Every structure is written in C-alpha cells, then in structure tokens.
C-alpha cells in the first residue's frame, strides 16, 4: 500500500489507471520504474527526458503529488 | 454529455483554444501534446509563459481564460 | 482615442515605442504579439523574467501601464 | 541636474560615487536604468529581482530617498 | 564512510550498485565500463541514461543513492 | 617543454598513460594523432559515446582535461 515499497508491476497499474496514460504505463514498466523510482521523478524528467507529451506528463506529475499528500 | 471542463477531451481543449484570438496554432500544439480538460486544469502560469515554445501574448490570454474557467 | 483593451499588436508597439528608451524593446512586444488584452494581463514579474526585458524599461513600462489602467 | 531627466550614464556616475557600489553601478548601466527607472525603484526591487547584497542596497535606497527628499 | 568512496575499486562499486534495489543486474554494466569510485563520483544524472544505456528506473535510484553517498 | 596546447602526440600519450586504468586508451590517442591541441578540443560526447572507450576511464580523462584547463 505504501508507495515506497511498490514494485514495477504496481507502478504500472498506477499509471495505467490514469486517463490516456495506459500507453506510457508500459513505458514506465519497460524502464523498470518501481515505487522508489516513481517518487524520485522530477517534473523535468517526465517531458524532455522520458519523451512524454505534456498532457499525460501533467496528469502523472499531479497524481504523484497526491501520493505525497501535498 | 457533461458541460464541465474537467472531463473535456483532447478535441474539446483544441476547440476551446482554437476559438481564442491568435491562439489557433497553439491549439494544434495543445492537441498534439494530448492536453485534455484534466491536464488543461493542471497547467501552471510558468508552464505557459516559459516552459514551452509559446509567445507570451497568447500565453497570457490562454492563462487568463483558464483562470476564469475555474469559476 | 481608443480603449487599450482593443489595442492591436501594432497599437501596443507604438505605445511601448513612445516610452523613453523603450524604442528597441517595443519590437519584442510585437514579436511576442502582445495586443492590448495581453498588455493589461502583464504583471510586474512578467516583464523582465518572461520577456528578457532589462529592468530599466521594465520599470518605466510597468509604471505607464499602471497609469494606463489609471490605478 | 534633475533626476527625472538623467540618462543611463548619469545614473551610473551617481551609483558609482557611492561607497562599495562601483560594480553595481555597472549593473545599473547594463540594465539601462535612467533617471526615471531609478525613481521607479522600490525598496524590494533592490534585492528581490536585482540580486544586490543588502549592504550596498541599503545605501542606494537611502541616496535615492535623499534625492526624492530635498528636491 | 569508513571506506572513502574515492578509493573504491571497480569491484567495490559493483557491490555498491548491487546493494541498490533493482540494480543487481545493472551493476554488471558499471563493472564492464570499469567504473571505480573515482568515476562513480564524476557521473552526472544525464550520464546514467544516455551514456551507459541504463534503464530509467535503476538510473534514478543510482543517482539518488550517490547524492546521499556524497553527503560525507 | 610541458604546455598543454603545444604538446605532441607522444606528450599526450604519456599524459593519458599515467592515469589509472587509461593505459590502453593512451595507445588509441597515439594512433589518432591527438596532440595537445586536439586534446583541448575534445568534448564529453567524444569520450563517452562517439568512440568505443569504457565510460569509467572516459570520465576520469574528461575530468583531468577539465582540471588541465583551469588556470
């Protein structure tokens, strides 16, 4: 349940639950992004570094901020 | 369907931005970046003014229309 | 003899160009396509940070915009 | 002689004459602060957007205030 | 750091990366490119992804644990 | 004598060779006729990727060239 111990499969389901983020979810899994790597992600990482369109990148970034409970 | 902007599709955002003065090219960019209504509401002032390759003028207008959209 | 909110991009250029020492930076407003609407949406932080504008003109521009809004 | 009609060079000499403000005078000149822009400076402006150390920023503020004062 | 990272051998670095979660396999690439403790500290965030063809997941955690290692 | 910009191909080799784990790479530098002039023209891309050289020694060579450029 705690995101810090989430696995790559867990993070996949997380991103795949987001609207229109079901394709990047696979790219999140392909790059072996577990719960730790997910929390290490910065806003710049998403777009320019991970080749992700701003739309999905915004929603993913926002959902991550929700896990950290603001 | 529903009138709320939070469930706007990628197309709805385009039509919203494309209808704005001098923002007809920017809408195409918005559409290309798959910016739907949910993402449109997540945009920050820094995102428009600086982040992406958008002229400040239209960026100021788009920003202001999103702010007014939230009430 | 015209309300600033309906000022075109060129109307704004001539406005900024008329300001002291702001003749060169007036082209940047036009380059950024700042019409009368986008002109009135500009904040003090927007001038230098978002548009590279030197602090000199930025102070004079911001001041004259406030007088334009009549404060 | 009147601050309002001072040029960028006149402002440079003014700041340069202040103790330990020599290098900052160069920044003023680079940022094209004329007499008008100099009088438009707020206390916050000195070290918020201009990145002046508090020390010389205090002296500059003080001399600008002495300018607006007796005059 | 009883063993200063600067004098870490190529094999000392392999064991370091191997101890990181999910970086057990990627550790072998650090050993392959002959990255000692000296090179490990010269690495930058961009170096991980592009230069060594490292997956982003491990690369993020490797980058983070190095920054925590440098706090000494 | 020993001045980086005027180094010969041999001077570079002896320089690269003295570095830990960069012994075989020094021989590659020889074969590519890299004198001190060409050594100072090398970029990070040239070391890491552009040629088959292990990143470890490539990083250390980069750093030592960077330290060599500080005066």
Curated annotation (Swiss-Prot), chain A:
It is found in: Nucleus. Residues 6-70 form the SAM domain. It comes from the Eukaryota. Component of a PRC1-like complex. Component of a Polycomb group (PcG) multiprotein PRC1-like complex, a complex class required to maintain the transcriptionally repressive state of many genes, including Hox genes, throughout development. PcG PRC1 complex acts via chromatin remodeling and modification of histones; it mediates monoubiquitination of histone H2A 'Lys-119', rendering chromatin heritably changed in its expressibility. The hPRC-H complex purification reported by PubMed:12167701 probably presents a mixture of different PRC1-like complexes. This is Polyhomeotic-like protein 3. It comes from Homo sapiens. The chain holds residues 914 to 983 of 983 of the full protein.
Curated annotation (Swiss-Prot), chain D:
Residues 6-70 form the SAM domain. Coiled coil: none annotated. It is found in: Nucleus. Component of a PRC1-like complex. The hPRC-H complex purification reported by PubMed:12167701 probably presents a mixture of different PRC1-like complexes. Component of a Polycomb group (PcG) multiprotein PRC1-like complex, a complex class required to maintain the transcriptionally repressive state of many genes, including Hox genes, throughout development. PcG PRC1 complex acts via chromatin remodeling and modification of histones; it mediates monoubiquitination of histone H2A 'Lys-119', rendering chromatin heritably changed in its expressibility. This is Polyhomeotic-like protein 3.
